[PDB]
């Protein structure tokens, strides 16, 4: 019942003044070691992260690749002197072990061995020794184990390199990369590291640190844990070297598709070689073989040191392209249409008959007409969907899609005032006066273009009195001001800018708190820094598409708001997310 | 190039991303519903070709890739010859 029968609202510890001060604040005595150089904030003494650059807007970071060198003071960086790359002891190690083949000695084969090997290589007879290992494989094994046996440390002791020495060479090298240099790098990374990044597991962390011989925090307890857990499987089960070993579809290997097929032909007249001629080569399904053909073309191009046709993926997949364009325009979204969003129509069994007899009875003058790439297209809508991407082809082919013409702003003749100068002051005033017409024939959105059409004589009438007393027709913007606001965004080529995003929505709707807007390092918005140019200036104009507000912003406001859970009394609708307000507020003076 | 002989005593632990976290017993908010109830504003992957003067995608990807390659020592000992 009524809470306040027999006692008023309780003010007990209303300041909760036990929360106001800690009775120990600060001084002029702050230890220069443990504070910032400015004594601004306390240093953080937990172990160094290597990614720190992503959370802080400091620009000296991006001048160097690896983190500990980003953190390095200028006074120290001055004392790194430029010397030949192999004068770096790790570069020396790399030069001796990996790059110098000539110093590599192989165990010499006996004469018997030479013979048995030769006769194995030339003619295979079954049951034989499966090894017969190529000296190429052997050599590469010796090299990879030279990468195994490489350990860092004090080099007055056994090992070749300081760790600092290694990452130093690494840093000099990463800054040194060209375009195709760091392309080769990222390929190398996607092929080796990335799959491992997917197959890892806590069970490996010790081994994972054995690569660099770095010592972990928990090392004894990890020893025990990992011992007990690796106990539960085969030792081959658990070693990360062998976890990638099998690949589905062994009939077509990526290694064998590196040489592209019939490259000495479709290079020389690529038009006479539609995807069909080549697609008869592979026993795979349609999507896969076209995919592969694309990769062939690209590999070939990079091999011949020329640039690849980037229009090729659009050309082979053309049907998929247009389906995606029209889907994007239909359901309003940017991306690639997936299965869930397909129409649920159920065709009859014989649905394809008309097209079947149309195909079966087709005839063609030459074979080029038979498969040209553009037979997919009939109407103008087809050509407008197929080329919307190149503003080259599009601008040349559809000149009328960029409006270069408009109804000119014209001055109306004034009505004569018989009162003469006595009233001439009157229509000359402070402001502009807009007048738009309304009535039964005007103001209907349905008819809007007909009403702004300069050809139509019933066209809605506007007028403007300029402060000097003249009258002119409305500018087209001013005309459009008098209709309910219209949203134009077409999703079919480039993504229109969408409202209620992270960088769009201002604070109070996005979070229920005020969040300061600084152009540097918003942790909440997961951005490192912002240079803030004028939005549409540097970007190409065809790229600007529109805006879409046409949905509910669910973080902010939703329909049919209710309590998610009635008990406990604490939960509300999912729109009420918020941090706890404290016991009474403390204000620290903030010039600091 | 630009070499000094430097001593770096402490490198933080491996960025495998998986480390047993600090354990507690009691928690501040005892209300697990907040996990499932929390929404946010939309993350839109792209606006208008995604052009930026600071090249974010490329630059951040490479910077991560660098220390990743450093820690795996270029993944160069791990794979034998299959």
């Amino acid at each position: 019942r009524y809470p306040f029968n027999k006692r008023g609202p309780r003010e007990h510890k209303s300041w909760k003044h036990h929360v106001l001060t800690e009775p120990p604040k600060p001084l002029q005595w702050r230890d220069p070691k443990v504070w910032t150089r400015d004594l601004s904030v306390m240093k953080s003494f937990d172990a160094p992260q290597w990614d720190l650059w992503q959370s802080r807007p400091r620009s000296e970071d991006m001048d160097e690749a690896l983190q500990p060198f980003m953190d390095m003071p200028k006074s120290l960086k001055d004392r790194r002197y430029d010397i030949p790359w192999w004068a770096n002891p790790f570069g020396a190690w790399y030069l001796q072990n990996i790059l110098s083949l000539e110093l590599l000695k192989l165990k010499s084969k006996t004469n018997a061995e030479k013979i048995a090997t030769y006769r194995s290589y030339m003619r295979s007879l079954a049951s034989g020794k499966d090894n017969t290992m190529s000296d190429d494989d052997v050599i590469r094994n010796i090299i990879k184990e030279r990468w195994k046996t490489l350990e860092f440390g004090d080099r007055n002791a056994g090992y070749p390199c300081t760790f600092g020495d290694y990452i130093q060479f690494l840093n000099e090298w990463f800054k040194s990369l060209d375009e195709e240099g760091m392309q080769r790098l990222r390929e190398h990374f996607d092929r080796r590291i990335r799959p491992l990044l997917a197959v890892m597991s806590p069970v490996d962390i010790l081994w994972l640190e054995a690569l660099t011989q770095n010592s972990p925090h928990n090392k004894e307890q990890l020893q025990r844990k990992i011992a007990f857990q690796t106990s539960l499987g085969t030792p081959e089960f658990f070693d990360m070297s062998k976890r990638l070993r099998y690949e589905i579809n062994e009939d077509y290997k990526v290694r064998d598709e590196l040489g592209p097929e019939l490259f000495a032909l479709w290079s020389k007249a690529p038009e006479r070689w539609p995807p069909e001629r080549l697609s008869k080569m592979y026993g795979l399904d349609f999507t896969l073989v076209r995919k592969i053909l694309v990769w062939h073309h690209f590999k070939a191009c990079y091999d011949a040191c020329v640039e690849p046709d980037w229009s090729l993926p659009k050309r082979l997949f053309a049907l998929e392209w247009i389906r995606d364009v029209r889907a994007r325009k239909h359901g309003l979204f940017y991306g690639k249409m997936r299965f869930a969003e397909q129409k649920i129509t159920f065709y009859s069994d014989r649905f394809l008959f008309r097209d079947l007899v149309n195909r079966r009875e087709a005839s063609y003058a030459n074979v080029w007409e038979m498969d040209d790439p553009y037979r997919f297209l009939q109407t103008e809508q087809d050509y407008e969907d197929y080329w919307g991407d190149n503003y080259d082809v599009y601008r040349r082919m559809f000149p009328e899609m960029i409006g270069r013409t408009g109804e000119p702003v014209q001055q109306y003749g004034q009505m004569p005032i018989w009162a003469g100068p006595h009233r001439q002051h009157a229509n000359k005033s402070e402001h502009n006066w807009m007048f738009a017409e309304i009535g039964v024939n005007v103001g209907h959105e349905a008819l809007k273009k007909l009403e702004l059409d300069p050809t139509n004589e019933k066209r809605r009438r506007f007028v403007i009195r300029q402060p000097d007393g003249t009258l002119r027709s409305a500018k087209m913007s001013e005309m459009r001001a008098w209709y309910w606001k219209e949203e134009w965004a077409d999703f079919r080529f480039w993504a229109p800018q969408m409202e209620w995003g992270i960088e769009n929505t201002p604070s109070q709707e996005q979070y229920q708190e005020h969040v300061p807007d600084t152009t540097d390092a918003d942790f909440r918005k997961q951005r490192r820094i912002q240079s803030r140019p004028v939005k549409w200036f540097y970007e190409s104009h065809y790229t600007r598409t529109g805006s879409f507000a046409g949905f509910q912003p669910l973080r902010f406001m939703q329909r049919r708001t209710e309590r998610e859970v009635r008990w406990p009394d604490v939960i509300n609708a999912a729109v009420q997310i918020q941090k706890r307000k404290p016991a009474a507020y403390i204000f620290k003076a903030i010039p600091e | 190039m630009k070499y000094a002989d430097l001593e770096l005593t402490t490198r933080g632990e491996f960025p495998h991303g998986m480390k047993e976290p600090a354990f507690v017993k009691k928690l501040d908010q005892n209300i697990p519903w907040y996990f499932s109830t929390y929404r946010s504003m939309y993350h839109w992957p792209i606006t208008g070709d995604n052009w930026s003067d600071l090249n974010e995608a490329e630059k951040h990807h490479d910077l991560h890739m660098f220390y990743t390659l450093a820690w795996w020592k270029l993944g160069e000992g791990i794979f034998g010859v299959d």
């Binding site: 230890d31 003494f45 937990d46 953190d71 | 005593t9 402490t10």
Partner: peptide
């Protein structure tokens, strides 16, 4: 910012921050 590479992670040399005298 360079200090972080030479510290021992468990050791927080002066947790109070105050040198006093």
């Amino acid at each position: 910012e360079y200090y972080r590479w030479f510290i021992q992670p468990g050791r927080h040399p002066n947790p109070s921050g105050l040198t006093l005298n």
